[PDB]
Assembly symmetry: C2
Homo-oligomer: 258 residues x 2
């Protein structure tokens, strides 16, 4: 039964071979394919990629920061609404990063947790993230990412749809990130993690990443690690970095893409 | 190079074999898998499924009705905001179906067309549809479907993400529907149709459809038809049913699912 990371390596191989040239916002070149999907099992393993060392400590710390709702870069400097502010205070008007937003906006993340435990069958267990630069740009701007949860047989699955995905830098970091979110939610709802499904719109490789990813393709995945939560934790806000332990992670060396 | 409909038949076969029992809103049973994707080429063919006769005339008429923005069921009886009203008047307050909503709300569909012709590289060419019953239900309710367009080399691609998909009845009808939308938009933006990518959250087969779909699996797809637009058309509002001709469609017989 093949290793999940073979999907990622195959998608990289496909973009290299079949991707078409397409420029991004800033006019920087990519090789691009529209529409991809991959599925990573979260059952007794954790999809932290092994063909390069992925920055797990930063996945953890940034996710914890989003879950706090912070718009204070210094906790990770008044950034405006980023993934925390929209995840915890969606639609509440944003003053400074120090302000007080209790009971203000939709709390998308708590709403997710609450629906899982009031109606696990619900097909609408959805949380969206916006790229901050889109918010001033237009009325009803499109989300950057939408995440859907699904529960069957006491297992929690998650599907992330991203309207674009940077295959070299952003995608491995996001697989780990939404896998960890799924572990965290499953933990507080008394469910077992199931699958993480990653779906992209414009899946792209930046031109300056082709060579480093060409070498990464030569590497054989090792068995994924396990993730342990080392405490019975109750509310999603109560998690801290020290509650998590990655086990049996043995990646190939770091690859710098910029 | 296999026929695109083999993907659909395979997904049906997978749900039958591996789907887990899961109830819908009304407590009706389905076999369910979370996360699927399929890709249908729109290049010199049109993905109107052939293992059963799909109701093309109703795909066309309902799509044309959505594009009108109508909330008048009699044009296809004051339904409230359905896919037209959100596609053409997103956020404008809805009185009666006869009212006057020019310049009211975001016109998601025109916005899509306008971005394709002002910035084809844009990764944010997105239009969402809501299930009407969700609108009174909560603040910032999740979309039912999100559709993303993509342009490279003068080809227009579309990805539909649906948070649930009824595999027996709804999915063939939606493949044809968003394929036709893609043909229509490509036509008015001077592009060639590219791919239609169909991605689902909870992909499910209703229990009472298992037997009919079991027979449908025994059938061999025929070559997809072609779709012709028989007029140079200018604005998306100017299309009419008689502008379209399906050619070389030779499906297997109708299958009634209810």
């Amino acid at each position: 039964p093949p290793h999940g990371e073979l999907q990622y390596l195959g998608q990289i191989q496909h973009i290299l071979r079949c991707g078409v040239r397409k420029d991004d916002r800033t006019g920087t070149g990519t090789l691009s394919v529209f529409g991809m999907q991959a599925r990573y099992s979260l059952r007794d393993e954790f999809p932290l990629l092994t063909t390069k060392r992925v920055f797990w400590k930063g996945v953890l710390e940034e996710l914890l920061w989003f879950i706090k709702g912070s718009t204070n870069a210094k906790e990770l400097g008044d950034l405006g609404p980023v993934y925390g502010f929209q995840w915890r205070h969606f639609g509440a008007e944003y003053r400074d990063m120090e302000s007080d937003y209790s009971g203000q906006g939709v709390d998308q993340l708590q709403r997710v947790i609450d629906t899982i435990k009031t109606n696990p069958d619900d097909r609408r267990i959805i949380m969206c993230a916006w790229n901050p630069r889109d918010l001033p740009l237009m009325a009803l701007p499109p989300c950057h990412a939408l995440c859907q949860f699904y529960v069957v047989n006491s297992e929690l699955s998650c599907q992330l749809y991203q309207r674009s995905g940077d295959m070299g830098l952003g995608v491995p970091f996001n697989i780990a990130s939404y896998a960890l979110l799924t572990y965290m939610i499953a933990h507080i709802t008394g469910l077992k993690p199931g699958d993480f499904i990653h779906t992209l719109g414009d899946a792209h490789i930046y031109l300056n990443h082709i060579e480093p990813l060409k070498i990464q393709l030569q590497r054989e995945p090792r068995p994924f690690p396990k993730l342990r939560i080392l405490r019975k934790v109750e509310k999603i806000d109560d998690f801290k970095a020290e509650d998590f332990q990655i086990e049996g992670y043995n990646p190939h060396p770091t690859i710098k893409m910029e």
